[PDB]
Amino acid sequence: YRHLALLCDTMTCRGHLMAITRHGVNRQDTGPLMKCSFEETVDVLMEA
Amino acid sequence: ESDTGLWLHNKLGATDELWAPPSIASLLTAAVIDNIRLCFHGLSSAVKLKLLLGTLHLPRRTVDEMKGALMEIIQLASLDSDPWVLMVADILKSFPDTGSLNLELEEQNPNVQDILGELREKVGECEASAMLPLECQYLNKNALTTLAGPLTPPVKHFQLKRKPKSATLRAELLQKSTETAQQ
Amino acid sequence: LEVFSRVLRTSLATILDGGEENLEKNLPEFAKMVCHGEHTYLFAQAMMSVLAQEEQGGSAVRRIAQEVQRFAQEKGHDASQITLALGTAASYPRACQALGAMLSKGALNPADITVLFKMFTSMDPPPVELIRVPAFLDLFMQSLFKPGARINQDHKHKYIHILAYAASVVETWKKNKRVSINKDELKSTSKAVETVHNLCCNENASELVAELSTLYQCIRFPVVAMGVLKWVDWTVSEPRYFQLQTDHTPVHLALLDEISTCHQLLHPQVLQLLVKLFETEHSQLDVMEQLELKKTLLDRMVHLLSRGYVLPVVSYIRKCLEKLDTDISLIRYFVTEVLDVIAPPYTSDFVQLFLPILENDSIAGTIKTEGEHDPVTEFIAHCKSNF
Amino acid sequence: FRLNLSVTTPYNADFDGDEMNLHLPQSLETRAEIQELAMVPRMIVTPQSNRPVMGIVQDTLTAVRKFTKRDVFLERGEVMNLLMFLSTWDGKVPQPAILKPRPLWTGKQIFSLIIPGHINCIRTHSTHPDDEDSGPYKHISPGDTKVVVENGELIMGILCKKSLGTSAGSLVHISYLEMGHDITRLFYSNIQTVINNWLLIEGHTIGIGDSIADSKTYQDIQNTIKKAKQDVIEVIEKAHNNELEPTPGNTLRQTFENQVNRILNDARDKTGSSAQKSLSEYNNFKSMVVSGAKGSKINISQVIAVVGQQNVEGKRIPFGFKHRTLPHFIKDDYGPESRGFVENSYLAGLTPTEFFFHAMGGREGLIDTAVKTAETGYIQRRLIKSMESVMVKYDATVRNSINQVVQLRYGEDGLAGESVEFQNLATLKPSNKAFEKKFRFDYTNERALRRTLQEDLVKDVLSNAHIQNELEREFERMREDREVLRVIFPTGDSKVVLPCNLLRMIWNAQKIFHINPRLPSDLHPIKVV
Amino acid sequence: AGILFEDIFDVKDIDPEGKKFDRVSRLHCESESFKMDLILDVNIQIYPVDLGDKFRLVIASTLYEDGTLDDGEYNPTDDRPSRADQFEYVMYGKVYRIEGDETSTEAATRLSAYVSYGGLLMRLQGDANNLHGFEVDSRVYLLMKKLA
Amino acid sequence: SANKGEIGDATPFNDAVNVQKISNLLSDYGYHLRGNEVLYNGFTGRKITSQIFIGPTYYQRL
Ligand SMILES: [Mg+2]
């Protein structure tokens, strides 16, 4: 339950739902090279 | 055996179980109770009761082999002044003599006479609507008329305006039974 | 001794004053001190054995002896040999020893039953009560009509003839002497019981229905009827019995109906089986299928109500509505069918027993599409006219 | 590469051509930190399910099961051969179980020598009878099916998978809890060595004699399947002549297939029950499955009794041809053989049609395995790249790379996942009266206080009413705690996750200090409070 | 010296529920005078036991008559005399359970001692006055002889 | 087949030969009905406590 509740609260901690997609993780400003290390690289670096 | 009075007291010392304990008929031995003949009054009244119950529980073939020791135990228990031991002696004084337990217990018991009289007159005044035996459930109607006489008629509380649907479907499946028989 | 005899007197007087409805209630609290000590048990056995030797009330007293002996049997007593000693079967030592050994074993021995047949099938039979004792016939019920446990059938005719002698023959006790006996019905009883035993052996469904017709013709016999009753009890009470249904086990449930129709004395046992089946919840099934199975069980129990076991049926309805509340749809369906099957005149006790269940729990919900005949309105009118 | 099966078990390694990678750090501090963090005794137990993951491999598991069977009587020469391979052996021979006529030890004695430390545990065997628990003989096991160990001495019980494997609260798990991880590693190695040597002496095989059954039960199987087949043909004829009444909630076709599935499931279950009743108790299949090493009771049923009905996409095999599963059957038939039920066993062999159906099932399983592995790899990569940034700071809270607080404590408790343990709470579920009789400690019952406490203790408790006030205050507090527990758990469940297993520490303290609780207590309740 | 218990017993029933293990079997006994109930595992292979057999029993602490109370190590080279010189079956193990038919008000009248003989069980239910000698977690023996 | 002196046939859907007939051939050639035999330890020399299955087959290295 520690890990499960930690996953769910890290999902919901931004005041709204966070589906594990580029379509969310690009919207959170959690590091341009985190975004680059995600599946899209050139667009997120190029926007940063 | 040696110190068989204290031995039997140890075996039957469990007074929390007022019935006949198991395996006492197997534990009993002819010479052991031949020694209990002369050490009989030393041991306790409850132990006397359990020993009498064990001698009653003893198999009939052993009883036939050693009728006399049971006679000695019967007369010792009759000489005993405990009311319960006396009643047990009265009930099993005819057990080895004939085979059945004693039915003529009418001697020296006015409480038994009074209770027998009031129970006989009570069942005489209330014998109507005699509630049926399980053995009369087992046997059929003809033997019921033979033994219990007339049967209790059913008592009806309402009117059946039409034949029930359960009986209707029972008749329908009886017709289907006739069909499945004729295929 | 005096206190126990006086308490025994008061309890027996209360039981005899009450009767059957008193029999299902105060017998555990009577059995708890007449079975507490086996010496007290033997004294009571002597007393009411003399009472059964008295002819008037002897049937009711012998029934009390039977149920006290049964209660001692599940309590832990080994007084089968003692009951035989009270009985006349102790006059014959070999018969008493063999019957006591078989009762202590609680099963059936082919060699012992050949011994019983051989001391039977004779020109001088013993007094029939040693085979009329119901615990020995309970042993036959357990051994014979089980769905499993097939017997070796070497002495099958001996078993069936022993049941026929136990449930068929009569005698006339003129000064404790038998001079007139009947033996013409034991052959038909043997044929019926043998047919039922072959049905239990072959245990198979189209041929089961085709022989179910002849089975009903045998169900006209009472020993056949309750043997089939307990066989159906075992078969249904076997778990996962409900894997295929056409009308929620209509063959066995119509066997229940025919048993209740043919014999009015089997209604308490039929009721016990039905309430056990209703109390048992079967999992791994559709909820709607379980709902309709409970509805069909209520259909059979309303059939019992039509055959006339109406006061205990309404009593069990009131009890099951008070504690462990079942479905309101089931209660409404039972009430609607009971009002369909009843008609005036009405007994005041029956109306009082059926009242609170009728005026609680959505009378407007019970009224759905009656139209032509108003069940509850006429019941209100008859109740107000009576009271 | 040469390595241990206790390391293969977490590695998912099974020696069918699987090769491993081996990295060696160059830097000495990296070597030291790898030594002191990623080492096998230091990480015996996983955090995710607080269970041991080293385990015991199948062959040594079955061998130690046959070694811990009750009737093991071992010769002096063999015990002599065995007790070199204990690394942590003290060097003294133990007393034999049998001394006269011949000196014979026992496997429980040898396993008591194997187990280091002094650990108290009770485990249940896989074939342990719950009715034997309910009735008498709960402390004298007729089948030795109650695993009991006390003070580092294995009392009774046949060890199995449920007692020695990855199960929660296992013997190796509580050993890693209590004594040193290096000691538990030596315990594993000693088990492997001596159980391998006892298996070398004993011998363990599988054969056709083990896989074959008897003709009477074979006839039982044929009668059962014939009854089921004629019953389902009766149901099919009922549907043909349309006496079938459809169940509400589904169509007649769905009701019919539900009936067929119910009948076939009941028949197959009865067949398996009959076989497992008649496995004759000398089958190595039975022995190894009871050890819990591999296989299953249903696998005995397919290999011996009958394969049974195979299902594709959660249903029967559809009509791939024109309303027929095969051209070998007629058009529009719904027989179990024609639709995918196998009437034969593996020992009996299969017709080519049901062999094709088993191929259907095997291909379905294999395609499921392939797509499962691929998709779970992609999903795990997604989850990792999602939450590669969350870690706990020195203030015991959870912050991301943005240092935003998410959890005030780790898992809202700040307690380690390896340290947390299953626990049963007795406060929640019993009645108020039972709670009072179990937690009040009434001081008025003078006989009870004489039996429980000493004479000075009872006279001081009765003299000081302030102590009684403190006990009553504690009782009110735990009543409020019971109310709090009934609030937090509306469900009637008493299982919880807790860092400590207090019952085990009670047992360990008792057997360390030799309490002998027949004597009255010597500790004051005010001291307890 | 060291005898915790000594009595006569009779094998009346052997493993009536079933025959599970091949080279060991459990036997049921009742004391001739002390009302002691006994169920004991025994090796049929080396010590054959027939039903209805009469045998003699001593549970003792140490083997020797001197009451030395040895540590319990297997020392076949010792020559101090013991009861095992004349005895025919000796069995050693740990007692693990001693319970009683007791409540909060009254003491234990029936005492039950469950002893584990390494891999063998013995349960002795009987009278507390004779079973006060047993105490939990002690080295005890069995001292079986079979008497004619 | 090795004890008999002939090449065995293992056609799948024959259904004319079975394990009972094979055990009959084993009893004919004198060996055990279920193909188990007694093995002897190479290190100690004591017999293996359990019977051991043995026999030829066809293996391939890869
Ligand atoms: Mg692999």
From Swiss-Prot, chain C:
Signal peptide: none annotated. Changing R307Q: Reduces RNA binding. The keyword Aminoacyl-tRNA synthetase does not apply. GO terms for molecular function: RNA binding. Changing R94Q: Reduces RNA binding. GO terms for biological process: negative regulation of transcription elongation by RNA polymerase II. It comes from the Eukaryota. The keyword Transmembrane does not apply. It is found in: Nucleus. Transmembrane segments: none annotated. Belongs to the NELF-D family. The NELF complex is composed of NELFA, NELFB, NELFCD (isoform NELF-C or isoform NELF-D) and NELFE; NELFA and NELFCD form a stable subcomplex that binds primarily through NELFCD to the N-terminus of NELFB. Binds RNA which may help to stabilize the NELF complex on nucleic acid. In vitro, the NELFA:NELFCD subcomplex binds to ssDNA and ssRNA in a sequence- and structure-dependent manner. Interacts with ARAF. Interacts with PCF11. Interacts with KAT8. Essential component of the NELF complex, a complex that negatively regulates the elongation of transcription by RNA polymerase II. The NELF complex, which acts via an association with the DSIF complex and causes transcriptional pausing, is counteracted by the P-TEFb kinase complex. This is Negative elongation factor C/D. The gene is NELFCD.
UniProtKB/Swiss-Prot annotation, chain D:
The tandem heptapeptide repeats in the C-terminal domain (CTD) can be highly phosphorylated. The phosphorylation activates Pol II. Phosphorylation occurs mainly at residues 'Ser-2' and 'Ser-5' of the heptapeptide repeat and is mediated, at least, by CDK7 and CDK9. POLR2A associated with DNA is specifically phosphorylated at 'Ser-5' of the CTD by CDK7, promoting transcription initiation by triggering dissociation from DNA. Phosphorylated at 'Ser-2', Ser-5' and 'Ser-7' of the CTD by CDK9 (P-TEFb complex), promoting transcription elongation. It is found in: Nucleus; Cytoplasm; Chromosome. It comes from the Eukaryota. Residues 351-392 are annotated as: Bridging helix. RNA binds at D18. Mg(2+) 1 binds at N12, D14, D16, D18. Changing M288T: In NEDHIB; uncertain significance; severe. Mg(2+) 2 binds at D14, D16. Changing T255M: In NEDHIB; profound; decreased cell viability. The C-terminal domain (CTD) serves as a platform for assembly of factors that regulate transcription initiation, elongation, termination and mRNA processing. The trigger loop allows entry of NTPs into the active site, switching between an open and closed state with each NTP addition cycle. Belongs to the RNA polymerase beta' chain family. This is DNA-directed RNA polymerase II subunit RPB1. The lineage of its organism: Eukaryota, Metazoa, Chordata, Craniata, Vertebrata. The chain holds residues 482 to 1010 of 1970 of the full protein.
Swiss-Prot record, chain E:
One of its GO terms (biological process) is transcription by RNA polymerase II. The modification N-acetylalanine is found at A1. SMART domains: RPOL8c (SM00658). GO terms for cellular component: cytosol; nucleoplasm; nucleus; protein-DNA complex; RNA polymerase I complex; RNA polymerase II, core complex; RNA polymerase III complex. It comes from the Eukaryota. Pfam families: RNA_pol_Rpb8. Residues 15-39 are annotated as: Non-specific ssDNA binding. Gene3D superfamilies: Nucleic acid-binding proteins. The keyword DNA-binding applies. Keywords: Acetylation, DNA-binding, DNA-directed RNA polymerase, Nucleus, Transcription. It is found in: Nucleus; Nucleus, Nucleolus. GO terms for molecular function: DNA-directed RNA polymerase activity; single-stranded DNA binding. Component of the RNA polymerase I (Pol I), RNA polymerase II (Pol II) and RNA polymerase III (Pol III) complexes consisting of at least 13, 12 and 17 subunits, respectively. Pol I complex consists of a ten-subunit catalytic core composed of POLR1A/RPA1, POLR1B/RPA2, POLR1C/RPAC1, POLR1D/RPAC2, POLR1H/RPA12, POLR2E/RPABC1, POLR2F/RPABC2, POLR2H/RPABC3, POLR2K/RPABC4 and POLR2L/RPABC5; a mobile stalk subunit POLR1F/RPA43 protruding from the core and additional subunits homologous to general transcription factors POLR1E/RPA49 and POLR1G/RPA34. Belongs to the eukaryotic RPB8 RNA polymerase subunit family. This is DNA-directed RNA polymerases I, II, and III subunit RPABC3. It comes from Homo sapiens. The lineage of its organism: Eukaryota, Metazoa, Chordata, Craniata, Vertebrata.
From Swiss-Prot, chain F:
It comes from the Eukaryota. It is found in: Nucleus. Component of the RNA polymerase II (Pol II) core complex consisting of 12 subunits: a ten-subunit catalytic core composed of POLR2A/RPB1, POLR2B/RPB2, POLR2C/RPB3, POLR2I/RPB9, POLR2J/RPB11, POLR2E/RPABC1, POLR2F/RPABC2, POLR2H/RPABC3, POLR2K/RPABC4 and POLR2L/RPABC5 and a mobile stalk composed of two subunits POLR2D/RPB4 and POLR2G/RPB7, protruding from the core and functioning primarily in transcription initiation. Part of Pol II(G) complex, in which Pol II core associates with an additional subunit POLR2M; unlike conventional Pol II, Pol II(G) functions as a transcriptional repressor. Belongs to the RNA polymerase beta chain family. This is DNA-directed RNA polymerase II subunit RPB2. The lineage of its organism: Eukaryota, Metazoa, Chordata, Craniata, Vertebrata. The gene is POLR2B. The chain holds residues 990 to 1051 of 1174 of the full protein.
